[PDB]
């Protein structure tokens, strides 16, 4: 069967709070940065 | 014979914000009246009121396009 | 004008459908399709709550038309009471594997 209970019903590990911090940082970070890099991308096109 | 024309008056057939038909009607009415006369001999002059209303209301570019299309055979309205 | 060739639920129904169907023929409701009928729910006449374990969630509509449902676990053992209205309920464990 699947694992149940705290830290186990999620698709990301919380075993290590620093590995986790990296992941949360990449994940919310990729999201927030994306628009800035699209503006960049269009400014460079012309 | 009102002449002493300032602008197209309120026409109760076209009482609301959209005045597209009003322009269009007066354009048809003029070129109709103009054909009646420039056929049966008489005077374009009796067509004058239709001319002043459509000239007042119609965008230049509409009249201009309508005129080009009368000339081309592609005018969709009945004259 | 007519003829056959079309199976029946009795011939061809299977798995849980067949189980629900045969239980209903005997007037039994093992799969909780029907609302239980309440008793007077006194100490002497408690609401009999079937379970395949030693606990099951009751929800008590204390009065007819009440929009608020009172939820609590009922454990195997002494009759518990609804915390809002006091009606008694008793767990009657074990079943299924027939």
């Amino acid at each position: 069967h699947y694992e149940e209970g705290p830290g186990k019903n999620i698709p990301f590990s919380v075993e290590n709070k620093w590995r986790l911090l990296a992941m949360m940082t990449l994940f919310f970070g990729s999201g927030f940065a994306a628009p800035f890099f699209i503006v960049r991308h269009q400014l460079l096109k012309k | 014979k009102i002449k002493n024309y300032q602008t197209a008056p309120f026409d109760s057939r076209f009482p609301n914000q959209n005045q597209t038909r009003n322009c269009w009607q007066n354009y048809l009415d003029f070129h109709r009246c103009e054909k009646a006369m420039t056929a049966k001999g008489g005077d374009v002059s009796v067509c004058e009121w239709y001319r002043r209303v459509y000239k007042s209301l119609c965008p230049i570019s509409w009249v201009s396009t309508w005129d080009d299309r009368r000339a081309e055979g592609t005018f969709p309205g009945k004259i | 004008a007519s003829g056959g060739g079309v199976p029946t639920d009795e011939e061809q129904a299977t798995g849980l459908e067949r189980e629900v169907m045969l239980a209903a023929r005997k007037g039994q409701d093992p799969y909780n399709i029907l609302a239980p009928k309440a008793t007077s729910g006194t100490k002497e006449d408690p609401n009999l709550v079937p379970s395949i374990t030693n606990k099951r969630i009751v929800g008590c509509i204390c009065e007819e038309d009440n929009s608020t449902v009172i939820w609590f676990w009922l454990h195997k053992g002494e009759a518990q009471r609804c915390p809002s209205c006091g009606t008694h309920y008793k767990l009657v464990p074990h079943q299924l594997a027939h």
């Binding site: - | 300032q6 602008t7 914000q17 005045q19 009003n22 002043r52 209301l57 965008p59 230049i60 570019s61 | -």
Partner: protein, 227 residues
């Protein structure tokens, strides 16, 4: 035009816009009153250690807070609708002017008598004159006679624009294939500004509207001079 740190409506240029201000004051008293009453009552509910956590009867009080709000809406609708139908009421204009929206400028047509038409573009910031207003000035203003009923017909030859003059309470969308009527009546001479009020591409922020309201004789001589 708007002035720095402006809070409310541009000062009323027509009697129609005069009516909107007094209707707005009306509606806003009602907004402040209700907003304040809600804020107050929240804090009243949240400032007592006294409790009543049992079931409360809902009949009597639900009456109060449907009838009262319903009366307030009628107090607002009444004058809202008086003003709507007053605006619509038949005027008899002395004059018709057409405006065509474009990417990215207004074209004007005065064609009651002569074939008068010109293009109206925003003065670039690098070419402003001392005391001219950034993004609001145009090369060719819309000269119009003050104290007289004018009919504006609005349209476009490309995409949607919208022709607005906040001081006169005017906004009429500019749609290709369509001629929208509106009526304009400045109680006063001067310069009355507006901006394209429907997103139309790259330069939507930069195709403004300037009305110059002068007496008839000046208007007639202007028109003659523009042919």
């Amino acid at each position: 035009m708007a002035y720095p740190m402006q809070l409310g409506f541009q000062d009323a240029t027509s009697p129609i816009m005069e009516e909107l201000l007094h209707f707005h004051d009306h509606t806003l008293m009602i907004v402040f009153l209700i907003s304040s009453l809600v804020l107050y009552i929240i804090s009243l509910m949240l400032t007592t250690k006294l409790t009543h956590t049992s079931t409360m009867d809902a009949q009597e009080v639900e009456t109060i807070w449907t009838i009262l709000p319903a009366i307030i809406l009628i107090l607002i609708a009444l004058p809202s609708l008086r003003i709507l139908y007053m605006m619509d009421e038949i005027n008899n204009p002395s004059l018709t002017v057409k405006t065509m929206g474009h990417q990215w400028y207004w074209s004007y047509e005065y064609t009651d008598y002569e074939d008068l038409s010109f293009d109206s573009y925003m003065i670039p910031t690098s070419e402003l004159k001392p005391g001219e207003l950034r993004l609001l000035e145009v090369d060719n203003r819309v000269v119009l006679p003050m104290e007289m009923t004018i009919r504006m017909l609005v349209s476009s030859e490309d995409v949607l624009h919208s022709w607005a003059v906040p001081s006169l309470g005017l906004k009429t969308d500019a749609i290709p294939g369509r001629l929208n009527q509106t009526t304009l009546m400045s109680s006063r001479p001067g310069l009355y500004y507006g901006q394209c009020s429907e997103i139309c591409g790259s330069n939507h922020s930069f195709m403004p509207i300037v009305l110059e309201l002068v007496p008839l004789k000046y208007f007639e001589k202007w028109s003659a001079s523009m042919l």
